[PDB]
Amino acid sequence: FQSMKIAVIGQSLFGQEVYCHLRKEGHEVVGVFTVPDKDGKADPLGLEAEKDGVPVFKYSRWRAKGQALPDVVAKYQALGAELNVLPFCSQFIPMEIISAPRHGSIIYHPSLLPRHRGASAINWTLIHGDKKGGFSIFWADDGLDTGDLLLQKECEVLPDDTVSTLYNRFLFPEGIKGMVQAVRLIAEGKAPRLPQPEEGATYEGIQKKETAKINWDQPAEAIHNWIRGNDKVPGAWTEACEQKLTFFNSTLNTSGLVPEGDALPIPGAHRPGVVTKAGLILFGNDDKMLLVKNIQLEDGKMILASNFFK
Numbered sequence: 001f002q003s004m005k006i007a008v009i010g011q012s013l014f015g016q017e018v019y020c021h022l023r024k025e026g027h028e029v030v031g032v033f034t035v036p037d038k039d040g041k042a043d044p045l046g047l048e049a050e051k052d053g054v055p056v057f058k059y060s061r062w063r064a065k066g067q068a069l070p071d072v073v074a075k076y077q078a079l080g081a082e083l084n085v086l087p088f089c090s091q092f093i094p095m096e097i098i099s100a101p102r103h104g105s106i107i108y109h110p111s112l113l114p115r116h117r118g119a120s121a122i123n124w125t126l127i128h129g130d131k132k133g134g135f136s137i138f139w140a141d142d143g144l145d146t147g148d149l150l151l152q153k154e155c156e157v158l159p160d161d162t163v164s165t166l167y168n169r170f171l172f173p174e175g176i177k178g179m180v181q182a183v184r185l186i187a188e189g190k191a192p193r194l195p196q197p198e199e200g201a202t203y204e205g206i207q208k209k210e211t212a213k214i215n216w217d218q219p220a221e222a223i224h225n226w227i228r229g230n231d232k233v234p235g236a237w238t239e240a241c242e243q244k245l246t247f248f249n250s251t252l253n254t255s256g257l258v259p260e261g262d263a264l265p266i267p268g269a270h271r272p273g274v275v276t277k278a279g280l281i282l283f284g285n286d287d288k289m290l291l292v293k294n295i296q297l298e299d300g301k302m303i304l305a306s307n308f309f310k
């Protein structure tokens with residue numbers, strides 16, 4: 001064993017939990033780098049670190065005129081970190097920071113690397129209807145999500161899984177355990193390095209609300225995968241009845257359903273939607289059905305799709 005000085009760079013409840021476990025294991029978290037508020041909620045990793053008197057720093061920022069801000073780097077170097085743990089970072093972290101610690105930097109990534117390198121990997125897993133998923137913890141190198149693996153765990157992906165369900169069922173609870181296990185291996189001097197194969201590598205970038213717009217010119221199954229692969233964040237959407245509607249809780253189980261109800265005209269779609277007591281029936285460009293159970297209105301109100309027209 002060895003108790004280590006660790007810099008934590010991340011966010012969210014996931015980051016908070018990794019932070020708590022590292023401390024429970026006897027490591028010193030020398031600092032936390034997280035996201036700002038927005039709005040006016042503070043990040044829970046930052047709030048937890050602040051409670052404990054651990055240095056907390058908020059970006060981004062991160063960069064200006066090519067290089068890493070001299071300020072952020074300064075704050076980092078004072079900490080004397082021996083390892084960086086990245087439980088949910090976002091932007092490229094300059095190699096002056098990534099490569100500074102004796103033990104380097106390890107990163108949590110919610111896909112089976114080399115598949116779905118880049119941001120929003122859980123979205124892209126489901127958008128493509130992958131039948132298996134999981135997470136990787138990997139050693140940062142100078143590429144984007146190309147570094148050798150430390151460990152990887154797989155799980156089955158179910159036909160109606162969403163980003164949120166797959167995360168809460170597996171990638172969150174097992175991912176936290178996995179990061180903890182990784183730090184233990186590093187502390188013991190027993191951490192593996194498993195180079196990523198070239199075969200099957202794919203890359204996608206961040207999925208912001210704007211690029212979650214539905215393309216209706218696809219089969220029902222692909223549209224279902226698009227909706228669930230953006231559910232709940234950032235939320236797949238379209239224009240209908242003169243507003244922006246976001247669709248959640250899709251299924252391809254349309255057993256016994258008939259397309260009778262109140263039309264929902266959707267510009268660009270192969271057929272109108274139909275609001276039924278079961279929810280919103282939608283058609284793909286193959287005239288096959290999918291069913292959306294919930295709709296978020298442009299003003300943020302969540303409703304049952306069956307209640308759209310009251």
Ligand SMILES: Nc1nc2c(c(=O)[nH]1)N[C@@H](C=O)CN2
Nearest residue numbers: 089090091092093098144145
């Ligand atoms: N140097 C480096 N920075 C990273 C990644 C990486 O692979 N290398 N991936 C993301 C980690 O959060 C974003 N930041």
